[PDB]
Design a protein around this ligand. Structure first.
Ligand SMILES: Cc1cccc(C(=O)N2CCC(C(N)=O)CC2)c1
Length: 284
């Protein structure tokens, strides 16, 4: 039985290596990673890989790994797939812990924009969780933390993290992680997966997929929001993605909004993440 080596980047930035039979479905690898991580609440997570176009794709647990990675290396990342709207309702601390690690990367990467004060508050909870109570021995007026807190670090941000860290004396890692999540979950881009698209008039927009529904960012003056209930059906054809929207009660007919994606694979990728989000958040 011939086995392929798999390399998985974990949320702490470490590499897990294992082997699976070469015809294995994604679920086989995912189960091995989750066992390694002592993760039971697996439903919120998945593995990503990079395609021949270098785009992030979700490894489908139901399909053979080889028919997805195709010509590419068997190299993956472990990621949050479905961001829980209320992390306090997760049953395990270790689940909240992996969600915190994901969000810290979302923030440092700039996928999850954040005000100065929220960057410093989130940072202060991370330090409390990672190091425990504030110690002036480690920290002088010139302190810079090893922790990455933001897409651009300043001395003022490092100072504010320490100031808030001082206020958290006696907080346990689980408690600090829960506070981190209570703040992160409120950010306007929390758990929003963004896709580049053009509207029916060729104007560049972003589509966001999240728990509550589909967002159309036409600009900061005009964001349209379609709660999952308002979304009749989803479809792709060629480079196009279509959303059918319920009529207002007493209008007779649904509306169709069409979008032009960069290529056929980007349209199919958007369709599949929408279907998965609608199913997941239909059942939550
Ligand atoms: C489709 C739809 C319907 C209602 C609200 C939104 C919205 O604005 N989101 C989702 C929630 C998110 C958050 N931080 O909870 C802020 C962005 C989207």
């Amino acid at each position: 039985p011939k086995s392929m080596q798999c390399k998985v980047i974990l949320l702490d930035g470490s590499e897990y290596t294992c082997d699976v039979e070469k015809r294995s479905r994604g679920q086989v690898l995912f189960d091995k990673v989750c066992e390694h991580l002592n993760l039971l609440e697996k439903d919120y997570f998945g593995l990503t890989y990079r395609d021949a176009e270098n785009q992030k794709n979700w490894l489908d647990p139901a399909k053979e790994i080889k028919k997805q990675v195709r010509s590419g290396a068997w190299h993956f990342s472990f990621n949050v797939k479905f961001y829980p709207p209320d992390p306090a309702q997760l049953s395990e601390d270790i689940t909240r812990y992996y969600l915190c690690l994901q969000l810290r990367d979302d923030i440092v990467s700039g996928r999850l924009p954040c005000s100065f004060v929220t960057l410093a508050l989130l940072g202060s909870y991370t330090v409390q969780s990672e190091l425990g109570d504030y110690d002036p021995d480690e920290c002088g007026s010139d302190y810079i933390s090893e922790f990455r807190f933001a897409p651009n670090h300043t001395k003022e941000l490092e100072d504010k993290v320490i100031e808030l860290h001082k206020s958290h004396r006696g907080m346990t890692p689980a408690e600090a992680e829960m506070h981190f999540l209570e703040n992160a979950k409120k950010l306007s881009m929390y758990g929003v997966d963004l896709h580049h698209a053009k509207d029916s008039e060729g104007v560049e927009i972003m589509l966001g997929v999240c728990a509550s529904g589909l967002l159309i960012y036409r600009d900061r003056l005009r964001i349209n929001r379609f709660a999952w209930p308002k979304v009749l059906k989803i479809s792709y054809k060629r480079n196009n993605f279509y959303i059918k929207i319920r009529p207002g009660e007493f209008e007779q007919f649904e509306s169709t909004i069409g979008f032009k994606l960069p290529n056929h694979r980007a349209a199919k990728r958007l369709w599949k993440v929408c279907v998965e989000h609608h199913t997941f958040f239909r059942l939550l």
